[PDB]
Amino acid sequence: GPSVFLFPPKPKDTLMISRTPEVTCVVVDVSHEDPEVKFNWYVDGVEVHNAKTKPREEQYNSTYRVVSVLTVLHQDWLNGKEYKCKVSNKALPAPIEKTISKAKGQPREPEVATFPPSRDELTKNQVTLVCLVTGFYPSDIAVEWESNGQPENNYKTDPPLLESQGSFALSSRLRVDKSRWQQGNVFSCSVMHEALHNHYTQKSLSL
Amino acid sequence: GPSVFLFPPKPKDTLMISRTPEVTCVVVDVSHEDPEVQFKWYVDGVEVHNAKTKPREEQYNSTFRVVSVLTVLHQDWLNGKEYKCKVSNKALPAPIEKTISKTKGQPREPAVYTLPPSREEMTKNQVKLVCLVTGFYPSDIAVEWESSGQPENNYYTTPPMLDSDGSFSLVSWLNVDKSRWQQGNIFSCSVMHEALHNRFTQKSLSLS
Ligand SMILES: *[C@@H]1O[C@H](CO[C@H]2O[C@@H](C)[C@@H](O)[C@@H](O)[C@@H]2O)[C@@H](O[C@@H]2O[C@H](CO)[C@@H](O[C@@H]3O[C@H](CO[C@H]4O[C@H](CO)[C@@H](O)[C@H](O)[C@@H]4O[C@@H]4O[C@H](CO)[C@@H](O[C@@H]5O[C@H](CO)[C@H](O)[C@H](O)[C@H]5O)[C@H](O)[C@H]4NC(C)=O)[C@@H](O)[C@H](O[C@H]4O[C@H](CO)[C@@H](O)[C@H](O)[C@@H]4O[C@@H]4O[C@H](CO)[C@@H](O)[C@H](O)[C@H]4NC(C)=O)[C@@H]3O)[C@H](O)[C@H]2NC(C)=O)[C@H](O)[C@H]1NC(C)=O
Numbered sequence: 001g002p003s004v005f006l007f008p009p010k011p012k013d014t015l016m017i018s019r020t021p022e023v024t025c026v027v028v029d030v031s032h033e034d035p036e037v038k039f040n041w042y043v044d045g046v047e048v049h050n051a052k053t054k055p056r057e058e059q060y061n062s063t064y065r066v067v068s069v070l071t072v073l074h075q076d077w078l079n080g081k082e083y084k085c086k087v088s089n090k091a092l093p094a095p096i097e098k099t100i101s102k103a104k105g106q107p108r109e110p111e112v113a114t115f116p117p118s119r120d121e122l123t124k125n126q127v128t129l130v131c132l133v134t135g136f137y138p139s140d141i142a143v144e145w146e147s148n149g150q151p152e153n154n155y156k157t158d159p160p161l162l163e164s165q166g167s168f169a170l171s172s173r174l175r176v177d178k179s180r181w182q183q184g185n186v187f188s189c190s191v192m193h194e195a196l197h198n199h200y201t202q203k204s205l206s207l
Numbered sequence: 208g209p210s211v212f213l214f215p216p217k218p219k220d221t222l223m224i225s226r227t228p229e230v231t232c233v234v235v236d237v238s239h240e241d242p243e244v245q246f247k248w249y250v251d252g253v254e255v256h257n258a259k260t261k262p263r264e265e266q267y268n269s270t271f272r273v274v275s276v277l278t279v280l281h282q283d284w285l286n287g288k289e290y291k292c293k294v295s296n297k298a299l300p301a302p303i304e305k306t307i308s309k310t311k312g313q314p315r316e317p318a319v320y321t322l323p324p325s326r327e328e329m330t331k332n333q334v335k336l337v338c339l340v341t342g343f344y345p346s347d348i349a350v351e352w353e354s355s356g357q358p359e360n361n362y363y364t365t366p367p368m369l370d371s372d373g374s375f376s377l378v379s380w381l382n383v384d385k386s387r388w389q390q391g392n393i394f395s396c397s398v399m400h401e402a403l404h405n406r407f408t409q410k411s412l413s414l415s
């Protein structure tokens with residue numbers, strides 16, 4: 001060290017305009033003898049100076065951790081702009097630059113399908129709803145279950161997986177009480193992806 | 208080198224009695240100066256002698272590759288016996304030993320549910336059938352699609368995913384031509400897992 005790791009914003013933050021997408025530049029193994037760290041940020045080479053550099057906190061292996069958060073514009077990230085964090089310290093010989101950007105490739109809209117429970121699974125008290133999300137590119141996506149405008153607890157969403165034609169797919173399944181399903185509660189699968197209109201679609205199901 | 212790599216049998220081979228599960232011991236970086244490789248095999252530390260060692264095969268980097276195959280008994284593998292491959296070579300200072308066995312943990316039976324397509328997807332030329340396999344342990348499993356006793360291999364299956372209660376889940380979905388679904392062809396999801404009765408279950412669906 002001192003090593004440098006640069007992290008992208010999360011898909012939902014880049015897709016919803018009210019949220020705050022951040023590029024996070026984490027520096028570790030910053031020593032006691034040479035503690036000074038200078039963060040220089042760039043957007044397609046153009047230097048920018050609005051990064052909140054949080055103060056260097058000590059880790060119990062006796063080296064400081066230093067985080068610099070650059071807030072990005074949603075459209076810049078989505079248009080494939082490159083974000084470069086330049087770190088400089090007296091311990092390291094020459095500056096460590098790292099660059100990230102959105103995954104490249106032509107955007108493809110997800111198709112979203114919901115499946116009600118099996119008649120066989122209705123025997124059990126716990127019951128499964130499935131949201132199938134297919135044909136999307138890039139893999140950056142948010143898929144979430146809700147009911148009555150609130151998040152639904154007991155679900156799992158697998159990672160996006162490549163199909164043969166280059167696009168991605170996943171399933172999300174929600175485990176609900178049989179009684180909630182049988183009394184007609186509406187459950188919705190919300191999908192956020194850059195290739196959807198308004199970056200958002202929702203599909204609902206009920207008995 | 209030399210370097211040794213030891214590979215387990217595939218779940219479907221361990222689970223179907225007619226099939227032939229094999230543990231495979233591969234040696235690479237075997238030199239021309241010391242080409243003699245001796246395999247010794249052990250099952251829970253007791254030496255066994257039924258391995259079939261293939262003749263050394265020269266590679267394009269001027270080293271030999273030597274493979275030894277031990278056929279295992281299905282029940283031995285499923286009972287958690289340890290298979291050790293011991294490789295002796297003159298270039299090595301001591302023999303290289305590698306050991307493998309089945310993933311540990313209490314077996315849990317998958318529940319299997321099949322879901323027929325969305326009426327919205329019927330607009331497309333292709334259609335999706337979903338097989339939901341949940342609550343299984345260990346993650347070693349084989350999930351396959353078929354119709355009329357023959358494989359339907361245009362599917363994708365998510366890797367086993369860890370649930371909250373310790374067990375694994377996955378989905379597999381089959382991409383079929385719309386016409387085949389509407390004609391009433393029966394499609395089946397076959398699941399092979401050690402915790403199922405007879406190591407196998409099948410769930411089917413068609414248009415009703
Ligand atoms: C002293 O202690 C230091 C701190 O560690 C604590 O750890 C405890 C367990 C314990 O040990 C304590 O004593 C100690 O206090 C320690 O620092 C560590 O140094 C390591 C380097 O040796 C770092 O390893 C790297 O980790 C990366 C992954 O980081 C994440 O996930 C882990 C957990 O899995 C987590 O610990 C980290 O904090 C980090 O979490 C992510 O954090 C970001 C930023 O905040 C989040 O993103 C933000 O999220 C917010 C909302 O919260 C918002 O959405 C913002 O938009 C967004 O910015 C993430 O959400 C969060 N992710 C989570 C939780 O999952 C790895 O990427 C990295 O791998 C790369 O480098 C390896 C070699 O170093 C290489 O082998 C590997 O292949 C990979 O290489 C890269 O590959 C990429 C492509 O795949 C390429 O693009 C790259 O170019 C390429 N890079 C290369 C080759 O360099 C690596 O494993 C470790 O992160 C760090 N720990 C922390 C906490 O920072 C220090 O080492 C210790 N010192 C000594 C001397 O011992």
Ligand SMILES: *[C@@H]1O[C@H](CO[C@H]2O[C@@H](C)[C@@H](O)[C@@H](O)[C@@H]2O)[C@@H](O[C@@H]2O[C@H](CO)[C@@H](O[C@@H]3O[C@H](CO[C@H]4O[C@H](CO)[C@@H](O)[C@H](O)[C@@H]4O[C@@H]4O[C@H](CO)[C@@H](O[C@@H]5O[C@H](CO)[C@H](O)[C@H](O)[C@H]5O)[C@H](O)[C@H]4NC(C)=O)[C@@H](O)[C@H](O[C@H]4O[C@H](CO)[C@@H](O)[C@H](O)[C@@H]4O[C@@H]4O[C@H](CO)[C@@H](O)[C@H](O)[C@H]4NC(C)=O)[C@@H]3O)[C@H](O)[C@H]2NC(C)=O)[C@H](O)[C@H]1NC(C)=O
Pocket residue numbers: 210212214215216217228229230231232233235236266267268270272
């Ligand atoms: C000289 O040339 C040598 C030969 O190479 C040719 O390759 C050409 C492409 C080209 O380069 C030619 O010029 C060249 O001739 C070359 O040999 C190579 O050495 C490498 C090491 O330096 C080896 O790397 C390892 O590979 C492992 C994976 O191997 C499989 O997959 C690859 C493809 O991804 C494939 O090429 C291999 O053949 C091998 O295939 C598997 O084969 C087995 C046995 O047949 C099959 O199992 C059988 O299947 C049948 C049905 O057919 C039946 O079901 C039976 O039941 C069953 O026995 C598999 O189906 C098949 N798998 C496939 C195709 O995917 C890696 O796992 C291994 O990684 C591990 O070790 C690393 C460190 O050493 C570590 O970093 C890594 O994390 C990993 O760690 C392990 O983790 C495990 C837990 O997850 C632990 O249990 C382990 O303990 C742990 N090990 C550790 C930490 O060490 C590694 O990368 C390479 O395989 C080998 N190539 C061949 C062809 O043998 C040589 O290096 C060259 N020398 C020089 C000096 O250049």
